[PDB]
Structures are given as C-alpha cells and as structure tokens.
Design a protein around this ligand. Structure first.
Ligand SMILES: CC(C)(Oc1ccc(C(=O)c2ccc(Cl)cc2)cc1)C(=O)O
Ligand SMILES: CC(C)(Oc1ccc(C(=O)c2ccc(Cl)cc2)cc1)C(=O)O
Lengths: 13, 270
C-alpha cells in the first residue's frame, strides 16, 4: 500500500 | 437460478454499464456500420497516424510527447487509455458486494493482479480481425499497421488480437462480460492476500452466478462456463507475457516513459 499510493488513493475516494 | 442470483447479476451489469465508457453493444454498433454512414477515422499508416495526432495534439504536448518516435507516441496514448480503464475498474470493483468490506491491502492486491486480465478481456469487445477502436469508438487503428511498427512495439498488440478473436467467437454480451470481469477481480489465489478465506467465498458467489447466468443466457452453448474458466487461465498467461514485454521496453527503450499508476501496478508483479 505504500508502494501503490495512487491505487490506494483511488480505493479510498 | 433464483431471484437473488438474478438480482446480483443485474446489479453487476448495472455497475458495468455505469462505470465503463465503452461496452460491447456500442462497439459492435460502430464496427458493423449499420447505424450511421460516418465510420471512425482509420489509422492504417504513418500518414493517417499523424493526421489523427493533429486532434490529439493537446494530449501529446501535455507531457512533451509530440516529438517522440511514432511508436512511443502510439503507446503513450494507449497507456492513457489503460489508466482510464484502471480507474473505471476501481469504481466497478467498489460496486461488487463485499469488495469494499475487504482489507484495503487486499483490495489493492486484487486490483494489481486483476486489472490487466480484465483490460484484455474487455479490449476484445472493441477488436475485430482487422483492428481496434480507439478514442471512445471514434477511431480505428489497423492490426496490420500495429504489426508494421518496429520491434519491440509491433509485438505488443498482436497477442491481444489473437486472444480476442477466439474470445469473441464465444459471442458473449455485456451481461456475461460484467460477471466475467467481476470473477477476474474476485480471485482468491493472488499473491500476498491477507484474508484468502473471505475472498474465496466472494469468488465462489460470483462464479456461481456466472455459471448459472451463462446456462440461462446461452443455453445452447452447453460448456460455455468451462470455456470461460479456461479463458481466465489464458488471460493470466497473457498478462504475464505482457508484463515481461513491458520490462524489456523499460530496459531497452530510453525515450519511452511509464505512467506512474501503471508503474505501481507492474512493480514486483510477476
Ligand atoms: C479526448 C481524447 C481524444 O481521448 C482519447 C481517448 C483514447 C485515445 C487512445 O487510446 C488512442 C491511442 C492511440 C492512438 Cl494512435 C490514438 C488514440 C486517445 C485519445 C484525448 O485524450 O485527446
Ligand atoms: C496495454 C499497454 C498500453 O501496454 C504498454 C505498451 C507500451 C508501453 C511503453 O511504451 C512503455 C514505456 C516505458 C516503460 Cl518503462 C515500459 C513500457 C507500456 C504499456 C499497457 O500495459 O497499459
């Protein structure tokens, strides 16, 4: 999750 | 197939229609030519490529791509479309019952390994044996033009066309494809999953609806469901080979750049 920052941000929108 | 299973299928279908800008019913309308006399612009050589790129000038100049080699410009634009489809897949996943309840790490893992299997499955909808629609159905890039590019770039899309021609012979519609994509995302055997049990139960529920849905919607293609189970395996292998090609390009093509969302996905994948 620290290595997938953009993907992680999309999932939390 | 009870009313609860039919409801889940119809709700997955709604989420698919609501989140993907392109779908098979639209793509086949365009590719067939029987709803307008104004076909998409055809990119079949370097000259028509450059003509199309006059419309795309702002996309290219945005990231200072406009003076790169043609091959790099083409796959810059292609990456932009993949980023769009990953973003849509993420919203679609959140609409799959139980997915948003999963550990956020598991959500990232499922999308990391699943998005390109779903991308190449759905890409089949906009492909025929001669080329693929681009720019939301407004253009059509030929398969022979892509084959004519210099190595390694000419080797990128041909295996996807090969997959699509056999996949399209199954004559799936969007109601089928929506459940197939959900089945691809909700996969219990991705590396690094923290709650494999919770995921496997989700996977079972979706695959059960997928099987009964196909038996109802394609009653004459008796083994369609096993055929599609094999296609899921084929997609995993197609994505593995694709990611190996992405690695070759990264190591050999100094003037090509990888969009940061796609960097995250490919990093440490296979
Ligand atoms: C709004 C518009 C036109 O949307 C596009 C959507 C998709 C693509 C493509 O995927 C593509 C790929 C390769 C070529 Cl050669 C041509 C097009 C391009 C633009 C843009 O962003 O300007
Ligand atoms: C399907 C697509 C667009 O396939 C690619 C094709 C070409 C590239 C590149 O041109 C490239 C540039 C720089 C690097 Cl480091 C690696 C690859 C990337 C992805 C994708 O996967 O979304």
């Amino acid at each position: 999750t620290e290595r997938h920052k953009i993907l992680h941000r999309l999932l939390q929108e | 197939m009870t009313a609860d299973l039919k409801s889940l299928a119809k709700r997955i279908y709604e989420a698919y229609l609501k989140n993907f800008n392109m779908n098979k019913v639209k793509a086949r309308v365009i590719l067939s030519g029987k709803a307008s006399n104004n076909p998409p612009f055809v990119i079949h050589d370097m000259e028509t490529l450059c003509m199309a790129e006059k419309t795309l000038v702002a996309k290219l100049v945005a990231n200072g791509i406009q003076n790169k080699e043609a091959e790099v410009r083409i796959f810059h634009c292609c990456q932009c479309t993949s980023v769009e489809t990953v973003t849509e897949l993420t919203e679609f996943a959140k609409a799959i019952p139980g997915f948003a309840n999963l550990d956020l790490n598991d959500q990232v893992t499922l999308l990391k390994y699943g998005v390109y299997e779903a991308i190449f499955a759905m890409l089949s909808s906009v492909m025929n044996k001669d080329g693929m629609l681009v720019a939301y159905g407004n253009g059509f890039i030929t398969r022979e033009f892509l084959k004519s590019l210099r190595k390694p770039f000419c080797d990128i899309m041909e295996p996807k066309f090969d997959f699509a021609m056999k996949f399209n012979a199954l004559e799936l519609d969007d109601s089928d494809i929506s459940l197939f994509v959900a089945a691809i995302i909700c996969c219990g055997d991705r590396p690094g999953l923290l709650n494999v049990g919770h995921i496997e139960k989700m996977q079972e529920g979706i695959v059960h609806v997928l099987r009964l849905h196909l038996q109802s919607n394609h009653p004459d293609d008796i083994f369609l469901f096993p055929k599609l189970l094999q296609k899921m395996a084929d997609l995993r292998q197609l994505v593995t080979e694709h990611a190996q090609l992405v690695q070759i390009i990264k190591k050999t093509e100094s003037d090509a750049a990888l969009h940061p969302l796609l960097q995250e996905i490919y990093r440490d994948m296979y």
